[PDB]
């Protein structure tokens, strides 16, 4: 039983711990944040998206009991102050926001304190970079700072994997219509990281916006190195997501043939559907990435081809359960 | 001053009539749709994504007076039976969604009905499809039925043709974020068009729909015509939308050109900005389309680009204000 | 016992799904105004209360849950609804348009049904339940039965234990209360007249009628004429929150309000001191969720108005309330 | 008179722009924690007022507004802030953050404070065409009260000065606001309700608005309390009173007395209207007689009224002609 850490319980952290009570022989026993027992055990209990907690939860001094299991709380502003082997912890999942990079993370790693780190998010080119059930493979346990990627490079990646694999991908350009997020204002006022865009209202606008995911899959997939680019546009649902891809192929293709071949390259991270679903359908799934043959294209004009992919994936629950298989298997060779 | 009748008077239908209180040679004198003139009155007076109506509203007998000036309101459900003629109605917007093809446009053009008619959505391929600025040059004025094209349509044209014009277009896919329509369920439940994504609650989904403003642009550009397709993607925003377009390109460019080029392009129906707007920021806009300079990308891989380029706008105001020019011009030339 | 479904609807669908979990009762039949693949979908996919639990697979005619057919019709009018050749003695009426003891009897003919419980308020004529507040009033022999409003049911514990604790004399009454499918998505004519219905439903707060506060005198007859409410209606898709400010018989406090609540909590009555939200509340099985974090009692120069406050998820609460009273409905007929 | 704005944020913004429209009174310097380029964007495009009406041009330390360029600094400390220098006597404080008399004050500085909040017992609050007349112009720092009290306020007083006011309970159905979390998320004002999705809940919450209602009408003090739900719309409000009278009366009697006490502030209608319609307008309070009951039950009445306001533009217009009227009497 790995003994691990969340640093920041927030919508990754909350959702990473929920998913962690059915793993086995990993378990969480210490969460830091900037806020008191109350606050987070209020909510690990009450989810506007995700729904009600499934267990028990009850305040106490320092902490939290969940199933009558205790779990600490600490409010420590500075990674380097946590003393997390006090409880036991080995491994960090951090989850802030703030310390995504390979020197702020590994704060983390001191006397008394873990000795490996996982960034809920791009860490950086110096980082390894890993989207389950894609290139998992690229980890042998020694490392002491990894990241699970960002939510759009999971569901990028094993569509793109597959249209590589199968045809062969020139270039393509992406855009995520994607659910409204914490960094974004409530109302229009002043952004803090200076976007002029997340300053403004995040469920009342459409709001474009830069995403690094498609320039950044390099990392995860080297042979796409340099050929994807892409954009979003936020859009006024709290969680859920869709990514849309536009290629060019080295081969001809049909619409069956790119469909069957996503078919064929499902698994317990990239599911297949056929089914005329919308984004409330996606809230909580498990898949990294819900491939949707209803919105293939393939479009062939003078006998050039323009292809067309979509891929669902609940921002929020299939990035949590990637990151968590990640961490999974992480801890289980390290 | 030309006499003009509204068949549908939704959201289209009133954003119309509001546009048409200034406009000088065109005047509405009759509305039709399914319901009483307190329900129609209520509903021009106060509109909660285009604002409170620029002017007095009271109701009265079999219609209701703006600005002191009385306009009838019948409620006939088939448009064989409205007697627009009574009222002096030349012209027809055609405005409820239930009529949008020649033949059933044509049928207020009867005996004490009206002479023309402009549907205001596509209305199939053997009526003439107009974008104003874009195409509106194919009118002669002896149609009987024509066609304001599409929201998306109209977004998508002037974007397109400045590429067409300047550095030739090989093929396209479009996507656009959508607001949500009156086409949509308010919350799940059985579709009337048969449509499982239109069946679903509009305002709490993110909903993959079909389009065919891509396809069909070859009726407005014929030199684009079998070479772009798409679809949209609905979403919670009561009104304003987004076009995307994904194209390849006869010349090698830039952004810089590419946005230069749309610049350049740009008049009362197409405009530009660089400034990093959202969709509220076009609510109400008399653009029929909106470049965002901003949004452009030119992505050069191995010597071959695929282009991006993306324009704003709000499928309700920017699509009437672009029918109002088409209406306006149509009734000038009507023969 | 077969039940039919009239009404495939927010609360046809949701009845549906609580009654695969109901031993003794099971829908053989449903009739909307469409193709059994609508139903079918619209049954595995729910914007606001999840993806269906079980398999759902279309045929010809209708469509299989779980492996058990279930027939699909698109019949207009109650009359000509066949609900006896699949088995059904009782019909679910839940399209909203035949709410009244005239219009629901349309379904009791020779090969149609022989009771119907009404998914609304259905007239002063019709026996109106609340489950596990009056559904004593029943005996079984009814032929139409209302199962009441979503607010109702959320409404009548609570001011049940205000008055047999206290005694109430007078109140008043507003829901906050999700949009529902009778607005409009957009500004446009509504079909009723409702110029507020007519507006956006899902981009503003909307002040509405309701009838629950005036019509509890159907469930507790010692309340009758001592009610009134109204409702605003907010951008949420499901989810729901009934104030009522009163005036009492006795002098109270904060805690022996949130004490009498708490002592008349059952299936249907909850009881929280959770400071949750309307999300909180969605797909819960409480018909009413009682909250002591809300409540007040006023005291100005001796004069005492009290404010007591209820969640209810007024697609699952009055499902769940509604399946409760089938259920007994069915077991005593 | 030249005025600062500290906190250009919701209020801040839309009191830059009804001063544009205010003759001898003008903006010479704002003061946030940002550079000017994100302020002037904002003031240029706003989601629920709508497109600035003028020109905005972004420049060193500051930008132009239709030609006039207008000081922007960043000083998180008030006490920091040199007002003088750009010519400014009276500062709106508007961050939210220094709503007391301790605080405010805190302003080579500025002469005069208005805060655009509730201010504190110890400092004079102005619900303006209910009690501005409070005002001498001695006052250091004033308050020009909450979006909730301009709306209650009159109303209220109407209800006194006709019949008479035993006790009331209020509910405002009120807007999400900045205060709120846009998802579920830590509330560094430690509310486990604000913390949520404001967006995508109704959210209990608690005003001070009818319990401070004394500090504008004295003879209501200690008579009314109340409470809030925050919905999903992100402007646009409704205040709800529930309330025992001294007199007998009918729905008809309270609709004309409202009616009759109508003025710029106090607005009067009878359409049935939605949030939507409330939004930009300048009226403190909008009372709505559509939504008026008088229940009467064994003799005994209950009334309930009813009255709209834009949480946003109608207080901001209130506090605008709070802060004209102050300026010309200090
Ligand atoms: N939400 C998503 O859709 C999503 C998806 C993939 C990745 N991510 C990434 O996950 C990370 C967190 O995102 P989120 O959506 O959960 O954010 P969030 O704001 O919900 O949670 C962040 C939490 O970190 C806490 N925090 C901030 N500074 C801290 C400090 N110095 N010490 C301890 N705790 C601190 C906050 O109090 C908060 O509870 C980010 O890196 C984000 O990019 C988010
Ligand atoms: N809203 C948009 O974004 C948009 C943009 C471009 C084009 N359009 C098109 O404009 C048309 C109307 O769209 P809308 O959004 O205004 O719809 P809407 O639903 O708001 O209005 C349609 C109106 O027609 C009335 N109506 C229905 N059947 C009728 C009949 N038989 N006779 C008379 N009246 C009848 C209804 O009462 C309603 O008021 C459609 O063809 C639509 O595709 C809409
Ligand atoms: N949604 C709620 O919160 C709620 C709560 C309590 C009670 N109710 C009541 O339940 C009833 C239905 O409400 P809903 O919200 O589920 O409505 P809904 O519109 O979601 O469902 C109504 C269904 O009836 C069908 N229908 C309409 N006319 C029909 C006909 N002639 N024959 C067969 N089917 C027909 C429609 O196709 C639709 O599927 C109403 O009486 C309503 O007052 C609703
Ligand atoms: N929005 C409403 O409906 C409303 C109505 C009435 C009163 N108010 C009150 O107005 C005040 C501001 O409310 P808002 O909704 O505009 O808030 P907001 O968050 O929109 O604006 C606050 C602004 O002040 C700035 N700020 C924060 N700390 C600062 C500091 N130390 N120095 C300088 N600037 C700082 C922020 O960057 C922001 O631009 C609050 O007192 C609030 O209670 C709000
Ligand atoms: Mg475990
Ligand atoms: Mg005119
Ligand atoms: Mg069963
Ligand atoms: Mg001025």
Same mark, same amino acid.
């Given at each position: 039983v790995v003994k691990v850490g969340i640093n920041g319980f927030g919508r990754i952290g909350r959702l990473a711990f929920r998913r962690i009570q059915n793993v086995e022989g990993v378990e969480v026993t210490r969460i830091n944040d900037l806020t008191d027992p109350n606050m987070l055990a209020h909510l690990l209990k009450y989810?506007?998206?995700?729904?009600?907690? @499934?267990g028990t939860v009850e305040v106490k001094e320092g902490g939290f009991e969940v199933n009558g299991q205790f779990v600490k709380v600490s409010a420590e502003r500075e990674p380097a102050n946590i003393d997390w082997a006090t409880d036991g912890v080995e491994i960090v999942l951090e989850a802030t926001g703030f310390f995504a990079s390979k020197e702020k993370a590994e704060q983390h790693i001191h006397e008394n304190g873990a000795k490996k780190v996982v960034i809920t998010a791009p860490g950086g080119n110096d980082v390894k970079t890993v989207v389950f059930n894609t290139?998992? @493979? /690229?980890? @042998?346990?020694?490392?002491?700072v990894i990241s699970g990627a960002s939510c759009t490079t999971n569901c990028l990646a094993p569509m793109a994997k597959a249209l590589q694999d199968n045809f062969g991908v020139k270039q393509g350009l992406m855009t995520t219509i994607h659910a409204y997020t914490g960094d974004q204002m409530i109302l229009d006022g002043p952004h803090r990281g200076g976007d002029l865009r997340r300053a403004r209202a995040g469920a009342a606008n459409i709001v474009p916006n830069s995403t690094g995911a498609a320039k950044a899959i390099g990392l995860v /997939?080297?042979?796409?190195?340099?050929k994807l680019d892409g954009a979003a546009q936020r859009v006024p649902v709290p969680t859920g997501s869709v990514t849309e891809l536009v290629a060019t192929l080295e081969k001809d293709v049909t619409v069956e043939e790119v469909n069957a071949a996503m078919k064929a390259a499902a698994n317990d991270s990239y599911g297949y559907t056929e089914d005329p679903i919308v984004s409330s359908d996606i809230v909580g799934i498990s898949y990294g990435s819900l491939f949707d043959a209803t919105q293939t294209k393939v479009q062939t004009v003078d006998g050039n081809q323009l292809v067309k992919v979509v891929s669902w994936y609940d921002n929020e629950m299939s990035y949590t359960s990637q990151l968590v298989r990640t961490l999974e298997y992480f801890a289980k060779i390290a």
């Open positions: 989810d506007t998206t995700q729904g009600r907690f @499934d290139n998992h @493979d /690229i980890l @042998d346990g020694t490392e002491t /997939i080297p042979e796409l190195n340099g």
